[PDB]
Amino acid sequence: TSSGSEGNVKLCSLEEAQRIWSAEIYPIMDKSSRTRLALIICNEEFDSIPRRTGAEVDITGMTMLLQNLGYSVDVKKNLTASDMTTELEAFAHRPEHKTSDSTFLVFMSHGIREGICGKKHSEQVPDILQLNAIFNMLNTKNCPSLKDKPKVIIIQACRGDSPGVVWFKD
Amino acid sequence: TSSGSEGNVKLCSLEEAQRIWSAEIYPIMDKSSRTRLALIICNEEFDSIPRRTGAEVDITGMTMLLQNLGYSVDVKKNLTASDMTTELEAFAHRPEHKTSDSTFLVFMSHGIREGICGKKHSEQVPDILQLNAIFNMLNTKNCPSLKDKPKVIIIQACRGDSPGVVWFKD
Amino acid sequence: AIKKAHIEKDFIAFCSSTPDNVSWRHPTMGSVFIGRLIEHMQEYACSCDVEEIFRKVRFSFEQPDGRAQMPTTARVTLTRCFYLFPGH
Amino acid sequence: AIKKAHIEKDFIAFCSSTPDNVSWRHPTMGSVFIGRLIEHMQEYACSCDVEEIFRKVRFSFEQPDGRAQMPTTARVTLTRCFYLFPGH
């Protein structure tokens, strides 16, 4: 039922869980004690580039979904690349990761080939957070609490100006 | 048996093939008519950077393996980034891809963060083939013959100077 | 006693499109990739691992229309299957 | 009649290590990643799809020694499972 904590996410039965269970699966911590964390950074209002209409629908959908999967969701809006970095650094230091088995990172903004655009981005003065930086801030060195634990990064953004298509005759 | 065309590769039985078979698997062309192609580019001897000893073992292993999987293997040695590009362009134009269901690309050389080193590479004058270029040369626009077909790229190379490890106390 | 560990491991990234290419967003319905990901996660989290769910999302984008995109899995260092086990 | 198709699709790349990090090669035995990939392909091509085989290769590198590396799957646009079906 949708009235529960899992919402619209189809539940895994105990018979299904044993059917999957092998030594090639990530371990899941006890539901009673675990403190799962997730972070959504969504840029909607920008200084130079047009407003991202419908971003609130994405925030709602992603926030609810990750909560349904058992993650406590922090939502941060309209940040620069420097502010995103600071927020990522703060997220990596959260003590709850030690009593968590995994994490989800969601980035939603305008994007170019180099990376994700901050709120202050323009072609004159770039304000870009690179994917490489996200990985570095969340790796074993900078985030030892999530060692051996799945780190899922989701990015909604353009990666260039091209339509991504070619023509062919049938 | 190792005396056959499949060599040391464990064979898939007809009972195993039907056990796997769904509409979520790449189609495989008839064995009697298909013309599968694979390319190995291996740089062993360089101008400035030290010789890659044991590269011939990798060539032997990869060549035999891909032949065992049913691919006709072209092996090219000691090329610059420009020569690799030209060879990739020639490979993408091969008519056999039209009567093939897939391809394998293998790159084996010295490497840096930017990409794979050619034979003429030095810190003074870089000779680098980027991974982006390989993808572009083999995509639907530049290689329409491999449209909808799996393109597996294998790269043996360093991606930097770091050991890739961090310390932790047990 | 100290032990060595991989600096980068157990990562998976899922991008809305391929490099150089645009990603689409409906002004009222939201981002196509985001809506599609939620739909597939809701349906397949119970039975499929995260990598397989992402593959399914990719397949749903297979037939290109007037506004096409191909989501990409990137920089994967998952050594095991990540099952969400929803409800557990 | 002309139809639209994705410019980049059905790709998988498998690199010997993570970005910024070294890959090892024995002077007589060959490259560690190459030898390990061949071994896993020989064993698992019959039963596992290419993505799963690569994951298994990654797992075999899990415990770091004096010469550590973590192979990485990159830029994946496979919409289906790639089974080799060796012998067929």
UniProtKB/Swiss-Prot annotation, chains C, D:
Determine the domain of life of the protein's source. Answer: Eukaryota
The SS bond pairs are none
Residue ranges crossing the lipid bilayer per the database entry: none
On subunit structure and binding partners, the annotation says:
Heterotetramer that consists of two anti-parallel arranged heterodimers, each one formed by a 20 kDa (Caspase-1 subunit p20) and a 10 kDa (Caspase-1 subunit p10) subunit.
Identification of the protein by name: Caspase-1 subunit p10
